[PDB]
Amino acid sequence: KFPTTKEIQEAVAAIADKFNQENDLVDRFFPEDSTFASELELYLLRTQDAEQTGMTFVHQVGSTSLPVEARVAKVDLAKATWSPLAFKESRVWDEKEILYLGRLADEVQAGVINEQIAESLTWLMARMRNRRRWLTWQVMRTGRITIQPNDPYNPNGLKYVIDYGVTDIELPLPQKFDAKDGNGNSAVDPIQYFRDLIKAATYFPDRRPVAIIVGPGFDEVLADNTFVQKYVEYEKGWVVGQNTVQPPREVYRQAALDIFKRYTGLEVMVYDKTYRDQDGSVKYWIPVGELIVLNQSTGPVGRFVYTAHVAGQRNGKVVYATGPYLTVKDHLQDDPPYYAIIAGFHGLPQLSGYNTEDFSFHRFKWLKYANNVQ
Amino acid sequence: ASELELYLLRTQDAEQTGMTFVHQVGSTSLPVEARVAKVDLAKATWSPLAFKESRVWD
Amino acid sequence: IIVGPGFDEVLADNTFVQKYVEYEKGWVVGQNTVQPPREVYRQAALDIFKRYTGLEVMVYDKTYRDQDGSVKYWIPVGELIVLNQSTGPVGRFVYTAHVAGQRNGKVVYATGPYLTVKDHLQDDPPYYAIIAGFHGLPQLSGYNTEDFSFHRFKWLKYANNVQ
C-alpha cells in the first residue's frame, strides 16, 4: 500500500501548489531563495539612491581632479557571522496501526494509504510553512531570533540567540493610548501621534510611517479614544450637545479603521492567521495590542534563504539537492516495525539590504499600547 | 452502503498548525507526535431512515 | 506654484483657510462644531487652495544629500517658488567645452557624454581610476527684447520657524 515515491513527489507538488496558491502578507514580504552555501550572511547591503546622493565637484582649469570620497564602500568592507538554523522532523507509523487502518479501509489499501499519506504530507507541510512564518515573524516583531529551551516546538531544549542589529525596534510611548483621564477621555490621539512621526521624519527620509500592520482586534481601542470619537463626530456631523445626545459604540467600531486610514494616510493591512502550539492555545502571529509599522517604504524586504541540503552526494564527487527534499523510509523489517517519512529542511530568513554609509538599519518598528485586551 | 457513519472527518488548518522542530546537528530526528489519527480512531453507531411512500386510487 | 516640503500645516494654521474649510464643508464653529480637528484641515489644505486660487500647485520634494550626511531638499522648508508668465519650458541647460585633443585638424567637436578611463597600475601607488565630467551652464530663456528685465519666477519667505 504505502508506496509510490514518484507519485508521492507528484502529490507533494500538488500539496505545495495548494499551499502556495493562497498567499499571505508575511509570505509576500519574503521570497523563497535557495543557496548551495551555508555561510549565512545575516543581511545583504543595498543603499545607493538619490537619498544618499551627493553632488559633484567644481574645479578650475590647470590641475588634477580632486578625487571622490567613496567611504561607503570602504565602510562596507566587513564580514557576516551567523549560523543557519535548520528545522527538520519526520512522522512515523507503527505497522500495528497501519494494518489496523488497512483492515479498517479494506476496499483500497494503496488508495486509502495514498489519501492518508497525502493528508499527513499536507499537515507536515503546514508545520513547515508555520515554522517559516514563526521565523520571519519572530524576527520582524522583535528585531532578532531568540530560542529559549521551553518552546513547544523545541522539545530538545536547544537554545540559540541570533541578532541582526536593527537600531530601535521599539517605539517611545509615555503610556498606552486608552488611559482614562479626567472623567473619561483618551490619553492621546493616535492620529496626531502618527502625525508626529511624519513631523519628525520631516528631514529624515526613512522614519516616515508608510504602511502599518496589525492583525487581531485593535479597533476598540481606537473606538474608545475620545479624540478619534471627536473625529467621527465632526466627520459624520454630530455635536453631543446639540445634534446627538450620545453616539453609540458600533458607530465608532464601524468607522475607526477607515477614518484612521483616511486621516493618517498610511495603509492598514490587517493580516493574521493563527499558530497552534503544543499547549493547546490559539494565538495569532501578531500578538494582541502591539503593531509593527514599516516606515521607509512599502515593497519586499529581506529574503528567506534555503540553506543547502546534506544528502547522499553522488556515487563519487559531491553535489546536493537545493529545494524541498523528499524521501521515504521503511523499518518494518525491524524489531519495532515502523513506517516513517522525512521532509523538512535547513533555512534562514535574511534581512534586506543594510544601509552602507552607516551601519544602522531600521525599516520597521513597533509599540505596545494595550494593558488589557480580553 | 448502508452503515450510516454519523460524522464525516476533515480538519487540517492553521488552527491545527504545528511547526517543525529545533534539532541539533548530526543527531537523530525527534519524531512527530501522532495524536491526530490516533485520537481519530473511533466507530460510529447510526442507521439510515429510509422514506418511502405510495399513493393509491379508488 | 512650486513648493516641495510640508507647508500644508502652515496652510492649516492660517485661520482664514480654516474658515474657508468651515463654511465650505459646512461647519459653523459657533453651531455645527466647537472646534474642528487639525487634520481635516491637513487633508483639505492643498485641495481648498487649488480650487480657490485656481493655479496649478505642483508639490515635489526631492531628497537632497549634502557632504556632512544630513538630509535636505532642493527647495528649502517653508516658503515656495512661483511661475507667473505661463507653464512651459523656461530656460535651457547648456553643455559646453567638449574637451579632448584640440585636434590634429579643425574643431568639429562632438556634443554629448564622452567618458574615458585612466589606469595607473604601473605607478608608485598602482591605482585605477575613471573620469567623467561636464563643462556646463544653465541658460535662462531670455526676455522679449523690449525691456531689459525678465521676471517669470519669484518667491517669498514666511518660514520664521523651521519646525
Descriptors:
part of a larger assembly, 3 chains, about 375 residues, alpha+beta, 4-stranded mixed beta sheet, 9 helices, 15 strands, about 30% helix, flat
Explain this structure to me?
The structure is cut from a larger assembly and holds three copies of chain A. The first copy, chain A, is 30% helix and 16% strand. The longest helix of chain A is centred in the first third of the chain and has 32 residues, at 109-140. With 374 residues, the first copy, chain A, is of the alpha+beta class. Chain A has a four-stranded mixed sheet. Chain A binds chain B through residues 85-93, 97, 100-101, 116, 119-120, 122-124, 126-128, 130-131, 134, 147, 151, 153-156, 158, 160, 273-276, 278, 282, 340, 342, 344, and chain B through 12, 14-25, 29-34, 36-38, 41. The PDB classes it as virus. Keywords: bacteriophage, auxiliary, HK97, virus.
